[PDB]
């Protein structure tokens with residue numbers, strides 16, 4: 298009747314941190330989004346109660362104000378894309394991103410103008426590398442989530458390959474590069490790829506752990522890693538939570554074993570790499586903090602559950 | 615017949631690092647110390663084989679060469695203290711400590727000829743050190759070193775009279791007798807931390823958890839020789855067996871968990887300090903970085919040195935399994 302969500306981040310070295318502009322950033326991004334009147338009534342309640350501004354302000358806590366605002370707009374845009382969610386539709390979004398100063402046709406879905414004004418504002422605080430990184434990764438995200446949604450698992454490892462692109466971590470990480478100029482030889486260095494990949498997988502586990510209760514009550518858990526593990530390893534729910542707790546521990550341990558062992562390029566690259574890795578580590582904390590403080594997964598019991606870990610299995614809806 | 619030393623640092627973030635000036639510091643420091651002829655023949659060989667310069671150079675791997683040299687002198691001085699304090703007890707400790715402290719307070723006044731040589735060894739150690747240690751660092755060393763000197767004498771007196779300890783109370787004593795607190799003062803060589811930043815409760819906690827891991831590591835390594843000479847009475851391995859009524863295998867697992875809990879508290883909090891702005895924030899970060907590297911440095915030295923495992927420590931470091939020495 299109840300299951301114990303493992304305390305995977307109990308000793309994680311990055312503490313919960315909140316951007317000081319949360320309140321302002323929240324009120325601005327909410328206004329910018331909601332002036333388009335583009336959410337249904339059901340969606341508006343979700344948008345508000347999920348507080349993607351909180352998610353963003355936790356993730357970008359140590360970043361400047363205007364980037365934090367971009368992060369707020371990005372998280373809200375993720376919702377907009379979901380809510381308004383094929384090749385022509387995504388090509389509208391990409392074309393707005395590619396041409397921020399181009400007037401969007403009057404007979405086009407409003408996501409084109411929302412995407413445009415988002416990027417118009419973003420390029421005022423994301424340097425050219427961060428810009429280039431976001432456009433590349435965001436396109437891959439859109440194709441992964443939208444264009445391939447129709448056609449869309451052998452095992453858990455093949456789920457994690459697809460989910461590394463559908464969760465949207467990679468475009469969110471581009472904002473960490475706002476005032477960085479990491480050359481391709483640094484960003485794709487094998488150790489840094491490993492650290493990034495381990496953080497993304499930890500993000501995946503955490504979100505599936507927290508969405509699982511609601512998803513199973515509705516029969517929507519087919520792609521949740523909890524369910525996938527149960528089927529692959531022939532184990533119950535409690536055994537699945539232990540298995541995923543172990544899997545998360547191995548990832549965290551690999552990160553801890555390595556994140557201070559990056560090689561040295563000289564300055565200013567070494568300081569960039571250090572701050573970028575700080576941003577990866579804080580991302581794992583921020584996602585988890587938000588997953589419990591938000592209404593999204595636990596409604597109004599999340600803070601209690603974060604401390605106590607026991608969750609009541611919801612009955613079939 | 616054989617115990618397993620827990621792989622306490624398998625996941626520790628700080629990698630082994632060695633000061634690039636190791637060989638020069640080692641040679642100058644060993645010559646400085648050996649010219650006093652303060653060691654018995656057996657103690658001269660041990661001083662050489664243990665190579666306390668390697669310990670200093672691992673722990674101070676990221677510090678300037680001259681500060682690294684001070685660290686080598688300090689690690690060698692601790693051995694001098696261990697060798698010479700053996701003649702002292704609770705009745706002579708204050709006059710004995712005051713000889714050393716008078717030397718540190720006055721690094722330029724040669725000591726009288728009728729006084730134990732540890733005064734002059736301490737004096738010339740400090741005469742060199744004050745050229746690269748700033749005033750907060752100097753003040754921090756003077757204060758913590760004095761406490762350490764009383765503590766080692768008193769601890770030897772308590773052992774001699776079989777004063778009782780359990781796990782928690784042993785740890786309280788050992789935090790002061792291990793010598794980590796004066797050693798940390800060198801980390802402040804070019805810092806000026808205000809008293810309320812240095813004594814901030816989280817920084818105090820981080821230092822304490824660091825020191826406690828250092829204690830556990832050292833006792834795990836020294837246990838084998840200690841238990842074979844019945845000298846393991848105040849060895850956490852023995853204190854755990856007694857306090858918990860468990861066997862060696864059980865005690866090793868208990869200590870593993872105890873180390874894990876300290877490591878988790880340290881990792882959980884090392885990036886949780888409040889902010890005072892610059893240059894106070896950079897100092898705190900670099901200070902804590904030195905605390906994190908000390909844990910690795912102590913461990914690396916404990917296995918590479920001759921001090922605990924002779925020439926077998928690199929195998930033990932890899933395999934963890936150790937054959938119980940028979941009674942000596």
Ligand SMILES: CC[N+](CC)(CC)Cc1ccccc1
Pocket residue numbers: 372375376464465466467469500504584
């Ligand atoms: C809104 C997207 N997401 C994905 C877990 C909630 C479903 C938050 C998020 C986005 C990007 C990276 C990490 C988390």
Ligand SMILES: CC[N+](CC)(CC)Cc1ccccc1
Pocket residue numbers: 669689692693792793794797828832912921
């Ligand atoms: C382990 C090294 N030492 C030196 C006195 C005994 C050999 C204890 C110690 C450990 C850590 C820091 C300072 C001293």
Ligand SMILES: [Mg+2]
Pocket residue numbers: 504505506508509521
């Ligand atoms: Mg999920």
Ligand SMILES: [Mg+2]
Pocket residue numbers: 692696
């Ligand atoms: Mg000693």
Ligand SMILES: [Mg+2]
Pocket residue numbers: 832833834836837
């Ligand atoms: Mg010992």
